Request: fold
Amino acid sequence: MIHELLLALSGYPGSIFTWNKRSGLQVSQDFPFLHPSETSVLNRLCRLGTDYIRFTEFIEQYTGHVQQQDHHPSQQGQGGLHGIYLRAFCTGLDSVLQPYRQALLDLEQEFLGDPHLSISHVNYFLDQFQLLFPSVMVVVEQIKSQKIHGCQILETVYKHSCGGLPPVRSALEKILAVCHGVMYKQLSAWM
Amino acid sequence: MIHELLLALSGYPGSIFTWNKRSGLQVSQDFPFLHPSETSVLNRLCRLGTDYIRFTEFIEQYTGHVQQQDHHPSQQGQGGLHGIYLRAFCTGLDSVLQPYRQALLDLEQEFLGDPHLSISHVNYFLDQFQLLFPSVMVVVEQIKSQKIHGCQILETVYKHSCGGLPPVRSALEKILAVCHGVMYKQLSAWM
Amino acid sequence: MASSSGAGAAAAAAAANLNAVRETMDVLLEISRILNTGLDMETLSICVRLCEQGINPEALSSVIKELRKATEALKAAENMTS
Amino acid sequence: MASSSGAGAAAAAAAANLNAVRETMDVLLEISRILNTGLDMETLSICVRLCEQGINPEALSSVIKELRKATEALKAAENMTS
Amino acid sequence: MATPDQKSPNVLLQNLCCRILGRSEADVAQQFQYAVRVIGSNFAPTVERDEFLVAEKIKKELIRQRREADAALFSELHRKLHSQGVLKNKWSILYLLLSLSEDPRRQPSKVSSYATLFAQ
Amino acid sequence: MATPDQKSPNVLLQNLCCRILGRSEADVAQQFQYAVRVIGSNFAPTVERDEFLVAEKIKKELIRQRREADAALFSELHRKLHSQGVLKNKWSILYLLLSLSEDPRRQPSKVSSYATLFAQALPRDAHST
Amino acid sequence: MATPDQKSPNVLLQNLCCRILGRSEADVAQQFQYAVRVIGSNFAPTVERDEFLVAEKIKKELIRQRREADAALFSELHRKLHSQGVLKNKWSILYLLLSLSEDPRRQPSKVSSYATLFAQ
Amino acid sequence: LWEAALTYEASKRRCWERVGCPPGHREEPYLTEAGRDAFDKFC
Amino acid sequence: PDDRSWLEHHVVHQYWTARPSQFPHSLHLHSNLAAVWDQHLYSSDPLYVPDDRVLVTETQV
Amino acid sequence: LAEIEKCIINNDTTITLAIVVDKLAPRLSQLKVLHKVFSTGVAEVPPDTRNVVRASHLLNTLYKAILEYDNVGEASEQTVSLLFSLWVETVRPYLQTVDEWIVHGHLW
Reply:
């Protein structure tokens, strides 16, 4: 069951964990082998997993798809995520999700090591990402909704980088560092 | 089998890899002990081996016989591949197969070192020759089919020297150099 | 809101399955009536389950016909002996 | 062919038991390290065998403490004579 | 492999016997044994295992029985069933239903009570 | 190829003395005799075979050393140990380890006070051993 | 010259059963008895005892299955086999191969678990 | 003896097909790749 | 074939062949998740006909 | 891939599908980029295009991809290197033809 849960968390929805385009990742049904309270807790973790899946979908939407060659590259950034800043945003998001992927693999290995471990151990171990991911998802959704383009995206990230969540602060600092690297590269080219 | 496979590649057909004068080296049949994907890999390797065998057969056909001192050397060129340039061509082909033989010996040493090695390692190691041999075989088949004779074969080699494969280009340069050495010997005698 | 997704989805799936089963049973009943097969809901459900379990339709049909003939012979014997 | 399956499975079970014992001993060593007990693997194994062999835990604890004090006194005597 | 708690073929056959005969399971034991023997026998493959061929055969049979309206209704119901996609073995159910169709005009040859004579 | 088997106390004590003193058994004969005398008349019918008391004591000790994270790790380790069925006398092993435990703080280099409390444990003495 | 100990058809059939079932000869005793009963039964002569007629029938059957390429391949393989002359009973082997051909288009009628009842 | 037995190392290979004894079980290579003796058996 | 069958059992199972290789697996819930899921499906929908599924090893996959 | 297969063959360590996917993740990303670039450079080229026209379309696609990956920065380094190698290889025949025209005065 843990392997299936991780696969859903790894982006492979199954018969237990159903993905809904509208609702995101959800537990598909009541399983006879789970206590309903255990089902409730698992779905509570599945909320974080759903956010992760939606983040991965966004990553594919903005970096995984070929940029339509609309002659005016400035407007490609509006409707579709496009622009070097958009690529930097996607790269930063993937870099921030890399530690989560590593933690998920470590959890899988640990659960493989000890058959007496329960899902509660994962819920403990994964709670840090259950707190981290929602804020970054909100920031990304704001970027998408405001159609931030070019360096104006950098300004928005800076404004969001001043958040109060220390882990969110560090993650946004990493993203801002990548964006500033892109900005500095452009500035280098100009100067 | 790996030793048997190399022997088939070394010209010793067996029960799994049969040599057919018409079909060349081929996997004899589907065996119950291999996955069909392994059968496909084996068939690709047998394709390479077939090309090698055909090259060796051509080498024997045009180089393997002692030159009959038939008084008229000019008529040998018509039916049979003949001429000093033909001998140079066969020598070049054997020289190009010499590095292939060396690579096969290195593969043999590796398989002796590790009995757990699989066909994928050979396919990786032998892929360079899997790319080299088909092009040279095509060139040789064109020479045979067009009955290129004397130094006019050299012109075809030049045409073949324009290939895109860097290793094939280098090999054809070596062969052309040997043929030009013979041509220069004749030219020296004349001049 | 997080915890609710498994049981709620299970309930929605069960309701949809029940409605689909009802629709299928109605279609099957209409087909049986048009063909004058003489099958009731329970017998039709049993036949459907057997076919889903892989029973040969020719064997199943022969068995059903033989069982009906045996039931008719038994009813005739019971009515003649009564 | 029948008989060979039992001895191989028994040997595998013994090896698994050995690995489990090793894991348990590792856990105990980690516990000692967190507790800064100062026991080495051989000493820990000897103590484990003694407790497993039925040594009275109050007696075992008193004996261990006395032995540790004696070992410390012997090490101090060896360092004073050196 | 989602095997619905399918009560054993024996239990299903017993339920079928009880329903068809209108008697309890205990009264159909000989009939249950006969059913088990019939079900266990190897049957030749059905004449048609193609849903569309079975539908066409059903339509032709209904037209031959002068049930053209029933043929159209059968075709429509078959289309609806195919679109519903709930049944895994449509060909088997269609073949069974076709094989079980009875012509209302041909007076059922009432199984003579005489079959009971040999049971003793 | 060693199979676990009950070996006489003399062999175990000899090995223990050898490893503790780091000398041959001939060189620890006096110490061996003293230990043998003390150990030879000591059966603990008074020890309550209850792991929970030992675990609680270990937790309290860890808290005293400001090692609450280590206490959690110890709890998890105890859970894993219970999961494994290698040890039968866990109460004895835990009691021995706790008695032989040395405080890393005694981190630091000493421990604040030793106001032993009545808390303690059970006396088991109640049974007719 | 001691023609390899070609074990009697009963032993060969037993080995074949063991291979097909993936069980030892001792586990297929009931199946071996069934095989002996089948083999001892009188079988009708094959419909066609002509190698070329059998090849043509195979090609026609493959065409009926819309496998025209497979029909051509079958005709070519049959010509090659006839020319090779290694097989003494070409008509019998062709009839066997025809009997063993399977239509890839017909969805396998999953054998109801109930068939096992008669296996005992 | 338990401690002499303690000095036994065991395979770290695990699988999610096995949970009761994850001491490894040697996937056992296949199609050539089991070495010369298996190839001779195949021949 | 017996020696060859013994090797074939010990040289990796014919699962890659259309012959069904049954392999022993742990029945633990975490290890038998496929079997437990099949059981739940079998328990949940009376219309569920079990499809023939090929069991493959994770290493084999 | 061969190194992964060797590690699988050794069977000494538990290798899971997740572990393999993660190991191939950088390679999988490079493969995705290569697939898109190849589709644009070759697959998008109409079959009836003149070889000169096919080549020019491929070359322009390569140039545009190069610009995109250079603007993508450090995260595309493996992809940028791949694209640079592709460009160098594709220009090798073109540069050779240019060289032959410049040196021998003959457009071969």
Helices of chain I lie at 2-10, 33-44. Residues 33-44 of chain I form the longest helix (12 residues). Chain I has two helices and no strands.
